Symmetry: D2
Amino acid sequence: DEAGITGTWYNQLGSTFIVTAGADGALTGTYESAVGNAESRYVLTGRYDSAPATDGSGTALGWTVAWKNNYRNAHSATTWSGQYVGGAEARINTQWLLTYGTTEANAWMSTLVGHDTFTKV
Amino acid sequence: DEAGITGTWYNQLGSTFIVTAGADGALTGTYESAVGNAESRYVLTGRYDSAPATDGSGTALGWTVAWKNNYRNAHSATTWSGQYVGGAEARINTQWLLTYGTTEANAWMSTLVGHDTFTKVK
Amino acid sequence: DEAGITGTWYNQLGSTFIVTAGADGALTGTYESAVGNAESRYVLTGRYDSAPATDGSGTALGWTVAWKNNYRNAHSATTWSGQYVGGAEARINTQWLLTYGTTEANAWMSTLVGHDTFTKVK
Amino acid sequence: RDEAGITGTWYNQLGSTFIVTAGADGALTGTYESAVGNAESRYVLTGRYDSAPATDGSGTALGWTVAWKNNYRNAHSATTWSGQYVGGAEARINTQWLLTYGTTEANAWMSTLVGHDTFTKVK
Ligand SMILES: Cc1ccc(CNCCNC(=O)CCCC[C@@H]2SC[C@@H]3NC(=O)N[C@@H]32)nc1
Ligand SMILES: Cc1ccc(CNCCNC(=O)CCCC[C@@H]2SC[C@@H]3NC(=O)N[C@@H]32)nc1
Ligand SMILES: Cc1ccc(CNCCNC(=O)CCCC[C@@H]2SC[C@@H]3NC(=O)N[C@@H]32)nc1
Ligand SMILES: Cc1ccc(CNCCNC(=O)CCCC[C@@H]2SC[C@@H]3NC(=O)N[C@@H]32)nc1
Ligand SMILES: [Br-]
Ligand SMILES: [Br-]
Ligand SMILES: [Br-]
Ligand SMILES: [Br-]
Ligand SMILES: [Mn+2]
Ligand SMILES: [Mn+2]
Ligand SMILES: [Mn+2]
Ligand SMILES: [Mn+2]
C-alpha cells in the first residue's frame, strides 16, 4: 500500500522510478529511463488500488510518462500497467505500451509493447 | 492541444471519458465504463505531449484508471496509451492494458490487452 | 469453420491474407502486406479451433508470418491472435505482435503491437 | 543458421514444455505442453522463423501458434508467441504472447490476454 509503494525503484534496464503513493490512490513522481530517446527525469502520474483484496494477491496500479522535459521531447508516451507484490523483496511487475506520434498512414507502427520488473535495488 | 483534448469523449463501447488537459502536460478527469466490473465514475490521471510536432503527427498521451470508487472496487487498473488526432472529426486512438491483482501463481493471466477509439460524438 | 475461414481476406491497411483451413485445425497460405518492409507474398502458417462453441462465440485462431521471401528479408516476424466471427459479413478480429531482430541491449524496443480486422472487401 | 539451435526441447518460467523442429527455409513444427491453464498433455504448434538472420549480433525473429484443442480438452482459445532466439553460451527464446479466447461480440473487448515467456533448454 502507501508506504510499500513509495520510494525508489529500478527495473532490469537500469531505469529509475521514483514514486509517491497517496492515501487516496494517486501516484506521482519522476521517471528516469536508461534507454531510448530520454535524458534526465520526466514527470509521471498514475493510480493504484488503495484497498486491495485480502487473499494475498497483488495491488493493481499503472502510470504514464510523457517523454517531454526541459531537455528533450520524444513526442511519445509510455504507460505501465501491473501489480505491486509486497514481501521481504518487494516487486512491481508491469507490462507497458509506448505510443509515439505518427501520421495516420503510419499509425499501424506507432506502439511498442514490453514488460518491466521493478525492485528496490 | 489543451483546447482540443479537453472535453467529453466516448469510445466504441459507450464509455465516457471526461478530461481536462492542463498547461504542464497533465490529464485529469473521470472515466465511466459501459462494460466490466464498474459503476459510475472513476478518477483518472495521465500525461500528454504539450508541444507536439506540427507535421501532421498526432499528440502522444496516456492515462490510468484504478477501478475503485465509492461504489465498487474491482482490484484492477487500466492504462491507455495513444494519440490525439485533430481535424474535423477529432479522435483519440488508444491501446490499453488492464491488470488485475493476482497471486503469484496466477500472475501469468493477470493482463488483458485491447484497443479503444474515442470521439466527441455522443 | 473450414469453409468459413478458407479464402481471401483484406485488412484495414489493404493487406491480403490468403488462407486455407484444414479439417484438423491447420492454417496455411500467404500474406501480402500493404505497408512496411515487405514485397509480394510471404508464407504463413497457423492453427484454429476446429470444434468451436456453438453458443454465439467466435472461433479462436492465430498465425505467424516471417518477413523473408525470395524478394526480401526484413529480419522480423508477426503473429496474429484473434477470432473468426461468422454471419452475413464475416470478420476476423485480431491483435498482433511484430518482433524484429535486435541486440540484447536493444531487446526492450523489439516488439510492436497493433490490431487488424479482416473482411472480404477491398 | 539457427536451424539446429532452435530445434530441440525448451522450457519456460511456468514449467511449460515447447518441443520444436526448425526447417531449413523457415518452418517451425512441434508440440506445446502448458503447465498452467485449461490445458492437458501436448498440443500441436506451427510457426515461422527468419532462416537467414542479420550479422551484427541481432537475434533471430520467430513466432508460433497453438490452438488449445487436442484429444483431451478444448479450451476454445489460441495463443501466439512472437519473439527472438538469441544464441551465445546459453541460448534463450524471449517472447511476448497473445492468448485469445472465443467470445460473443458483446464481450470481444475482454477476449485477449498478453504476457511474456522466456524459454531455455534447461530442466
Ligand atoms: C521508425 C520509428 C520512428 C519513431 C520511433 C520512436 N521511438 C520511441 C521514442 N521514444 C522514446 O524513446 C522514449 C523513451 C522510452 C523508454 C522506454 S519506456 C518503457 C521502457 N522501460 C524503461 O525504463 N525505458 C523504456 N521509432 C521508430
Ligand atoms: C479469470 C479472471 C479473473 C479476474 C478478472 C477481472 N476482470 C477485470 C476486472 N476489472 C474491470 O472489469 C474494470 C472495468 C474495466 C473496463 C475496461 S477498461 C478497458 C476497456 N475500455 C472501456 O471503456 N472499458 C473496458 N478477469 C478474469
Ligand atoms: C527504430 C527501428 C529499428 C528497426 C526497425 C525494424 N522494423 C522491422 C519492420 N518489419 C516489416 O516492416 C515487415 C512488414 C510488417 C507489416 C505489419 S504486420 C502487422 C501489420 N498488419 C499488416 O497487414 N502489415 C503490418 N524498426 C524501427
Ligand atoms: C473471464 C474469462 C472468461 C474466459 C476465459 C478463458 N481463458 C482461456 C483459457 N485457455 C487456456 O487456458 C489454454 C492454456 C493457455 C496457457 C498459456 S499460453 C500462454 C502462457 N504460457 C504458457 O506456457 N501457458 C500459458 N478467461 C477468463
Ligand atoms: Br526512436
Ligand atoms: Br472480471
Ligand atoms: Br522497419
Ligand atoms: Br480459463
Ligand atoms: Mn519498425
Ligand atoms: Mn483466461
Ligand atoms: Mn522507437
Ligand atoms: Mn477480466
